[PDB]
């Protein structure tokens, strides 16, 4: 199964100029495009190698449609400043995420479209793609305008249509890189923290996609106390990294096992300190 997602941010800049607009597109955990209103080109730009083969008609249409959205977001920053009774002095943010999911047969599974103001839920398209949920009374104004203009219909036509059709084509053109499941390369480190305690650190490196579980067990029972789990992080080469650490009584290392679950492991993997 696969996803395509776009991520839009507009930021008003009182004391600078027009709002900063930034767009990024993803297939699963791979970015393929960007647009930045401050960059010289004023164009949608390739960020993955398999999108470079699209012709100038692709780049012209994508640039026009994302610029149109940056204009809507500029007017929208003004409107929402009105709705919340805020001064022209302050900087405010509109975020938008949307996209579709397809199964391994390329068929529509799901659509999403969600909007935020100042880092908080504003309005969401419901999973039926026909109706909206507003976070507050300001967003209820938006919802009523969007019901009256039948905006749900244009979103449904995109998510069940162009969104799914173009994701399939992206998965075919990028098949050499986007269909890969790179399993984690694993190891364990040990550091004395005192004469009576030590840290075991369980590593997963070089994995794709990002979704992974590291769990520490003691005698077969899941262990949350005395652990640290860092956020999955990019290596910067297309792979991801994660680690999990547990503090253990010294000479009791053998009681602890680390479990690794990932799409690319046929059987789950268990690490124990030698």
């Amino acid at each position: 199964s696969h996803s395509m997602r776009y991520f839009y941010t507009s930021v008003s800049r009182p004391g600078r100029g027009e709002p900063r607009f930034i767009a990024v597109g993803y297939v699963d955990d791979t970015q393929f495009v960007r647009f930045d209103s401050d960059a010289a080109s004023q164009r949608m730009e390739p960020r993955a190698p398999w999108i470079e083969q699209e012709g100038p008609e692709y780049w012209d249409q994508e640039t026009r449609n994302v610029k149109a959205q940056s204009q809507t977001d500029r007017v929208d920053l003004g409107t929402l400043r009105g709705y919340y009774n805020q001064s022209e002095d302050g900087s405010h943010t509109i975020q938008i995420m949307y996209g579709c999911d397809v199964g391994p047969d390329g068929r529509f599974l799901r659509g999403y479209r969600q909007d935020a103001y100042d880092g908080k839920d504003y309005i969401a398209l419901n999973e039926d793609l026909r109706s909206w949920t507003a976070a507050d009374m300001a967003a209820q104004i938006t919802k009523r305008k969007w019901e009256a203009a039948h905006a749900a219909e244009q979103q449904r036509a995109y998510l069940e249509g162009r969104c799914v059709e173009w994701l399939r084509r992206y998965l075919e053109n990028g098949k050499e890189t986007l269909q890969r499941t790179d399993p984690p390369k694993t190891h364990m480190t040990h550091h004395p923290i005192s004469d009576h305690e030590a840290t075991l650190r369980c590593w997963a490196l070089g994995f794709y996609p990002a979704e992974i579980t590291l769990t520490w067990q003691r005698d077969g029972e899941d262990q949350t106390q005395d652990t640290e789990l860092v956020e999955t992080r990019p290596a910067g080469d297309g792979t991801f990294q994660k680690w999990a650490a547990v503090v253990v009584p010294s000479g009791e290392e053998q009681r602890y096992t680390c479990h690794v679950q990932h799409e690319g492991l046929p059987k789950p993997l268990t690490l124990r300190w030698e």
Binding site: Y6, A23, G25, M44, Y58, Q61, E62, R64, N65, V66, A68, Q69, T72, V75, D76, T79, L80, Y98, D115, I123, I141, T142, K145, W146, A149, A151, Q154, Q155, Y158, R162, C163, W166
Partner: peptide
């Protein structure tokens, strides 16, 4: 590809 031009004001 991105959602088409004809978006609706908030």
């Amino acid at each position: 590809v991105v959602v088409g031009a004809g978006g609706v004001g908030k």
